[PDB]
Amino acid sequence: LLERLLGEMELELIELRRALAQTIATFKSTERQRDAQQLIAQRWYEKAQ
């Protein structure tokens, strides 16, 4: 069992590693998306100047 159990454990860990990366993508993606909106608002403010 010991050999088989660890093999399953190692396989699971990389799956966790892969999944966490996808979380970072959205965290970065929305942040980049957020900057876009304020830039548009700046254009109107600059135009309103």
Binding site: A25, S29, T30, R32, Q33, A36
Partner: protein, 49 residues
């Protein structure tokens, strides 16, 4: 016979308009707008990748 021609002289005109708009719809959906940030635009899907 006189009435016959007045139809044919217009049929080619309608087809041209139909081909113009149908193609335009095909182009626009592939616009790949950068602002979507949802994978609807294939470009932003690449950026997520």
């Amino acid at each position: 016979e006189r009435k016959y021609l007045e139809l044919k002289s217009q049929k080619n005109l309608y087809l041209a308009r139909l081909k113009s708009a149908i193609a335009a719809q095909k182009i626009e959906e592939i616009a790949g707008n950068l602002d979507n940030a949802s994978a609807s635009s294939l470009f932003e899907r690449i950026e997520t990748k």
